[PDB]
């Protein structure tokens with residue numbers, strides 16, 4: 001009850017003053033979206049679980065981030081009455097500032113999916129398949145109502161920071177791929193010691 005209401009208010013707050021939360025709604029804040037998600041994958045690597053992160057720029061400037069960590073948990077979270085992944089993602093600034101966001105969790109030999117719009121879940125978390133892997137996939141589309149100047153990512157910007165993050169976080173393989181033009185796909189992959 002109260003907990004879920006807290007959530008909605010939090011989404012409203014973020015969408016009303018997005019620059020207070022991500023610095024700006026310029027091109028810089030657009031790329032900050034990617035940094036927020038990649039930092040979560042880095043934390044799961046530092047915790048000992050993940051070692052591979054992939055960032056894909058998809059057609060129409062969707063971003064897909066994939067890690068091979070444990071998978072965000074799906075167990076019903078005691079204070080919300082809702083799956084843990086739903087709590088974590090409805091408290092995410094990226095989700096609030098995305099027109100659409102999808103999660104796929106590989107965990108417990110199961111693939112779970114949920115989708116969101118401006119942070120609001122579109123359906124309850126569902127089992128959609130099976131798996132013998134663990135990890136988490138998040139795909140999002142930046143909200144052009146927030147990012148009013150541009151929602152087009154800059155590969156070089158992405159590449160320079162990804163390269164830095166792999167250099168700083170030795171052992172994690174981090175891959176960037178641009179699939180926006182299916183006729184000319186570019187990938188860079190970084191892996192320091």
Ligand SMILES: CCCn1c(=O)ccc2c(-c3cnc(-c4cccnc4)s3)n[nH]c21
Pocket residue numbers: 036037038040041044065066067069070071072073088136137138
């Ligand atoms: C591309 C997805 C990036 N990403 C996020 O944006 C947010 C959370 C996480 C996690 C986990 C958090 N907590 C875990 C957890 C904790 C305890 C037990 N099992 C998993 S996994 N992994 N990746 C993430």
Ligand SMILES: [Cl-]
Pocket residue numbers: 072073074075107108
């Ligand atoms: Cl779980």
Ligand SMILES: [Mg+2]
Pocket residue numbers: 036039
């Ligand atoms: Mg954060």
Ligand SMILES: [Mg+2]
Pocket residue numbers: 036039040
């Ligand atoms: Mg974080």
Ligand SMILES: [Mg+2]
Pocket residue numbers: 040043
């Ligand atoms: Mg953290």
Ligand SMILES: [Mg+2]
Pocket residue numbers: 126127128
């Ligand atoms: Mg079903």
